[PDB]
Design an enzyme around this catalytic site. Structure first.
Site, PDB file in Angstrom:
ATOM      1  CB  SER A 146      36.238  42.582  31.045  1.00 15.45           C
ATOM      2  OG  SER A 146      36.576  42.110  29.778  1.00 15.45           O
ATOM      3  CG  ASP A 250      33.558  36.584  28.032  1.00 13.15           C
ATOM      4  OD1 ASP A 250      33.752  37.610  27.347  1.00 13.15           O
ATOM      5  OD2 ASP A 250      34.137  36.348  29.108  1.00 13.15           O
ATOM      6  CG  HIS A 299      37.904  38.702  27.658  1.00  9.79           C
ATOM      7  ND1 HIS A 299      36.685  38.655  28.302  1.00  9.79           N
ATOM      8  CD2 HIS A 299      38.746  39.365  28.487  1.00  9.79           C
ATOM      9  CE1 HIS A 299      36.789  39.249  29.478  1.00  9.79           C
ATOM     10  NE2 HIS A 299      38.032  39.684  29.617  1.00  9.79           N
TER      11      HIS A 299
HETATM   12  O1  LIG Z   1      37.697  41.951  33.711  1.00  6.33           O
HETATM   13  C1  LIG Z   1      37.827  40.819  33.184  1.00  6.33           C
HETATM   14  O2  LIG Z   1      38.626  40.672  32.192  1.00  6.33           O
HETATM   15  C2  LIG Z   1      37.025  39.647  33.747  1.00  6.33           C
HETATM   16  S1  LIG Z   1      35.811  40.239  34.994  1.00  6.33           S
HETATM   17  C3  LIG Z   1      34.745  38.890  35.511  1.00  6.33           C
HETATM   18  C4  LIG Z   1      35.115  37.502  35.224  1.00  6.33           C
HETATM   19  C5  LIG Z   1      34.278  36.387  35.614  1.00  6.33           C
HETATM   20  C6  LIG Z   1      33.125  36.700  36.277  1.00  6.33           C
HETATM   21  C7  LIG Z   1      32.797  38.126  36.539  1.00  6.33           C
HETATM   22  C8  LIG Z   1      31.593  38.124  37.209  1.00  6.33           C
HETATM   23  C9  LIG Z   1      31.044  39.373  37.561  1.00  6.33           C
HETATM   24  C10 LIG Z   1      31.807  40.522  37.218  1.00  6.33           C
HETATM   25  C11 LIG Z   1      33.034  40.477  36.529  1.00  6.33           C
HETATM   26  C12 LIG Z   1      33.521  39.171  36.206  1.00  6.33           C
HETATM   27  C13 LIG Z   1      31.001  36.835  37.438  1.00  6.33           C
HETATM   28  C14 LIG Z   1      31.887  35.865  36.885  1.00  6.33           C
END
Ligand SMILES: O=C(O)CSc1ccc2c3c(cccc13)CC2
Ligand SMILES: *[C@@H]1O[C@H](CO)[C@@H](O)[C@H](O)[C@H]1NC(C)=O
EC number: 3.1.1.98
Length: 353
Positions: A146, A250, A299
């Site tokens: 993630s 995702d 995820h």
């Molecule tokens: O860590 C998690 O579970 C989620 S991170 C995350 C969600 C959604 C986005 C992200 C982006 C860049 C870097 C990280 C993310 C662009 C859109």
């Protein structure tokens, strides 16, 4: 099976609230392979939003309450049955406590309520591990899920290059980016900043004084560095071998796209939206030689205990990773590029439930 906590001896490298960052370690005396896994967990992009995270996600902002140990699961498991790939490796779990997608190099000071030091946390962990056996490594695999998967893409080349400038050119640095390959696409329904993927990072990167890989920075230049947080834009600029693992649908991508599959028949507009999302994700992976991208709504995967279960074209993720290892020495029956072509979540029957 347990990884032991070590807080950073360099206590100027901190979590958001100034407590020292750290890492969980399980050494494997007889192994020359090192796995440094970057935890995920979103981010915060301003003072008020980070204060909210401090209230109810404090372990993601502070080491004050971290346990002394942590069980290695999935690719961090030491049991061959759970981890056919690298069960014998030295295992490192780096907790995510900087809320900056591992990009920050910013100390807490009188002008900053929070420290954002993810980039520095990674290099300090690498520095402190050299004296615990990493100096003798042949392979350093920088993995992450993630936000930690995006963190691999932002940091793999930097880890490589300190190891070279520190006199260790023999260590082969590689990347494993799980569920961190996002699209800067249009939401399905507009919301106010569930911030749209694009604008979340522009505000975050300014707030953290986040840093991106050098070649990618030189392409996009000042004020446009948010672009390097998007896998399909930053990956072509990297030198280190990077294996990309990415669900085609995702859950975090759908979340920021304001897509909620709450039962009920999906209507034509959302169907085409979701099908176009999978197609565009496939398209961005066509020229990624080492990749694993099943057509599932899910995820993360690599630190789940049942990560062995999912297959693309008959090949599991631990097998694909072993095949990647062999290719880094056109293999018969040992593919490294595995991307589903079916167009709807769970058209692959090995998808998680
Ligand atoms: O860590 C998690 O579970 C989620 S991170 C995350 C969600 C959604 C986005 C992200 C982006 C860049 C870097 C990280 C993310 C662009 C859109
Ligand atoms: C501690 O980390 C900071 C931030 O990277 C660095 O500037 C400093 O030189 C380090 N100090 C020691 C003693 O390693």
């Amino acid at each position: 099976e347990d990884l032991r906590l070590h807080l950073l001896l360099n206590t100027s490298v901190t979590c958001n609230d100034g407590s020292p960052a750290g890492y969980y370690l399980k050494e494997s005396r007889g192994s020359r392979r090192w796995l440094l896994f970057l935890e995920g967990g979103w981010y915060c992009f301003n003072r008020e939003n980070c204060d909210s995270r401090y209230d109810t996600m404090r372990r993601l902002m502070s080491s004050r309450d971290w346990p002394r140990t942590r069980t290695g699961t999935g690719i961090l498991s030491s049991q061959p049955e759970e981890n056919p790939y690298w069960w014998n490796a030295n295992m490192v779990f780096i907790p995510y406590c900087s809320s900056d997608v591992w990009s920050g190099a910013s100390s807490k000071s009188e002008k900053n309520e929070y420290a954002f030091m993810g980039a520095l946390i990674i290099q300090e962990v690498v520095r402190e591990l050299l004296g615990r056996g990493l100096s003798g490594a042949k392979v350093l695999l920088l993995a992450g899920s993630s936000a930690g998967g995006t963190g691999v893409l932002l940091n793999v080349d930097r880890v490589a290059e300190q190891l070279e400038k520190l006199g260790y050119p023999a260590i082969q640095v590689r990347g494993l980016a799980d569920s961190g390959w996002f699209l800067d696409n249009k939401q399905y329904r507009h919301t106010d900043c569930t911030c749209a993927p694009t604008e979340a990072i522009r505000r975050g990167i300014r707030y953290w004084n986040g840093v991106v890989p050098e070649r990618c920075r030189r392409q996009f230049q000042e004020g446009e560095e948010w672009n390097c947080f998007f896998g399909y834009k930053v990956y072509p600029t990297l030198r280190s071998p990077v294996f990309v693992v990415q669900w085609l649908f995702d859950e975090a991508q759908l979340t920021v796209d304001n897509v909620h599959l709450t039962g009920q028949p999906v209507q034509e507009g959302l169907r085409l939206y979701i099908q176009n999302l999978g197609r565009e994700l496939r398209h961005t992976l066509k020229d990624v030689p080492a990749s694993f991208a099943p057509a599932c709504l899910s995820h993360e995967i690599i630190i789940r205990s049942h990560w062995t279960d999912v297959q693309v074209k008959g090949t599991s993720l631990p097998r694909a990773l072993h095949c990647w290892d062999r290719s880094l020495h056109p293999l018969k029956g040992c593919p490294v590029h595995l991307v589903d072509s079916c167009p709807w979540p769970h058209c692959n029957p090995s998808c998680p439930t």
